[PDB]
Design a protein around this ligand. Structure first.
Ligand SMILES: Nc1nc2c(ncn2[C@@H]2O[C@H](COP(=O)(O)OP(=O)(O)OP(O)(O)=S)[C@@H](O)[C@H]2O)c(=O)[nH]1
Lengths: 142, 190, 145
């Protein structure tokens, strides 16, 4: 259900998410399963939701967070780091800070998002080294 | 003052209790019903000698489809826990043949700490009786003492997740190994 | 009419119930409306603004009326296109605008030449198009000219 869920979250529709929790409960499938995660970079539902949104109000974040809470895997899900080389270590908090939305930052911090996570991807490295942007590899520094 | 973040990765053969070891470190409560295949994305606070360290604990598995993604967890590792079982002798001879060269291939010049699990199980009678069916005996601690020397392990220890014996000291040794700055560079090019 | 900055006349003449002047029409020289507009184009501050405005308006109208064919594709007898002719004649004012042409309209955004790739903080990465700007011997290139 990775493609359908990705499309639903990208479109921002909230009704389509109905029935996901019963499916997870019946199949006992966690939201961090390899199948759900994008193979290319280990990207998960939450960073995809935060990347694309309308006026900073994607409106799908709280529902997904509640679902993760019900599954009992909120801590792992919120701060799931990206794999690969270019965007290694990036988390949801960095994206929320970058998009200049205070509300999602407050939500992630309150729900238990890690605040000392380090982003060490090559894209985040200094200019002369190969990374187009460098900010100290920290949320507060960013 | 400011806690220092260090990366610890635990690697061992299946059913060795690596996940149980890290879980007992995490919540000091043995899960007797449900054990996740991997315990990921956890940072624990530890103080050893006037220093505060946040240890990021990573686990590696190969039960299903985890071998392909295992290499991704090695880079930027600060300390390795080479983990095996005292109740399963087969967990020993496989350490040098296949695990060690991979460790040196991906992340060289990294401190490695040997650890054997299930200290009590070595003295059990049912385990000994079942194991004798194949002409095998529990792992001898002295054999581990020497095996640590052969593979150049920083230190080798024993842990028992059931009775929470030596977990604190073992991971403290891991951390003290991590804080070590290593020795410059060897045979560095001109 | 286009070269004399008379948008109303061009609009009326393009769409009239009696007769219509197709924009993809070539004279003896082969130059079409865009070719002539580039020919009279000048590097002066005032001339460039109206030249670019008329060029964009006419190109959008031609694309809207005929979606299959692109107006810039037509070539003159010399074989050059409006971009190539502007490059050869040394008219930077229209050339730079043509290179970085971007259309916000969804219906006819395909004919744009500059796209946006992604933005990360102060860093902005944009994806230009060089279909005809660089050619590996298939056809004349703007760079060589
Ligand atoms: N006698 C004894 N048995 C233990 C002890 N600790 C753990 N065991 C068993 O070890 C197991 C360790 O879990 P786990 O490491 O995930 O097994 P695994 O199948 O090898 O996991 P994997 O590497 O294939 S992904 C626990 O499930 C528990 O049943 C102990 O202290 N004493």
């Amino acid at each position: 259900n990775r493609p359908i869920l990705f499309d639903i979250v990208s479109r921002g529709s909230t009704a389509d998410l109905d029935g996901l929790l019963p499916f997870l409960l019946t199949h006992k499938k966690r939201l961090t399963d390899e199948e759900f995660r994008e193979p290319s970079t280990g990207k998960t539902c939450l960073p995809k939701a935060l990347l694309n949104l309308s006026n900073g109000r994607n409106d799908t974040i709280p529902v997904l967070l509640d679902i993760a809470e019900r599954t009992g895997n909120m801590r792992e899900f919120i701060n799931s780091p990206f794999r690969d080389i270019y965007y290694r270590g990036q988390t949801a908090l960095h994206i929320a800070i970058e998009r200049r939305c205070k509300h999602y930052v407050e939500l992630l911090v309150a729900q238990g998002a890690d605040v000392h996570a380090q982003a060490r991807g090559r894209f985040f490295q200094p200019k002369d080294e190969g990374g187009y942007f460098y900010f100290g590899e920290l949320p507060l520094s960013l | 003052m400011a806690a220092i973040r260090k990366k610890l990765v635990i690697v061992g053969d299946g059913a060795c209790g690596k996940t149980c070891l890290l879980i007992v470190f995490s919540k000091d409560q043995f899960p007797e019903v449900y054990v996740p295949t991997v315990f990921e994305n956890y940072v624990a606070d530890i103080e050893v000698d006037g220093k505060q360290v946040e240890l990021a604990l990573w686990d590696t598995a190969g039960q299903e489809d985890y071998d392909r993604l295992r290499p991704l967890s090695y880079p930027d590792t600060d300390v390795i826990l080479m983990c095996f079982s005292i109740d399963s002798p087969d967990s020993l001879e496989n350490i040098p043949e296949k695990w060690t060269p991979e460790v040196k291939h991906f992340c060289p010049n990294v401190p490695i700490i040997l650890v054997g699990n299930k200290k009590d199980l070595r003295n059990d009678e049912h385990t000994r009786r079942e194991l004798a069916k194949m002409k095998q005996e529990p792992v001898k601690p002295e054999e581990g003492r020497d095996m640590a020397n052969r593979i150049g392990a920083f230190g080798y220890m024993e842990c028992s997740a059931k009775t929470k014996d030596g977990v604190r000291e073992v991971f403290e040794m891991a951390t003290r190994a991590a804080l070590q700055a290593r020795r410059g560079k060897k045979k560095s090019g001109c | 009419a286009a070269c004399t900055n008379q948008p109303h006349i061009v609009n009326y003449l393009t769409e009239n119930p009696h007769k219509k002047a197709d924009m993809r029409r070539q004279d003896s020289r082969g130059n079409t409306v865009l070719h002539a507009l580039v020919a009279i184009a000048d590097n002066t501050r005032e001339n460039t603004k109206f030249v670019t405005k008329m060029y964009d308006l006419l190109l959008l109208k031609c694309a809207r009326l005929f979606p299959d064919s692109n107006l810039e594709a037509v070539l003159n007898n010399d074989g050059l296109s409006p971009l190539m002719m502007a490059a050869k004649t040394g008219k930077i004012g229209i050339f730079q605008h043509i290179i970085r042409r971007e259309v916000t309209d969804e219906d006819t955004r395909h004919l744009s030449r500059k796209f946006k790739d992604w933005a990360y903080g102060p860093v902005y990465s944009s994806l230009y198009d060089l279909s005809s700007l660089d050619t590996c011997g298939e056809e004349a290139s703007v760079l060589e000219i």
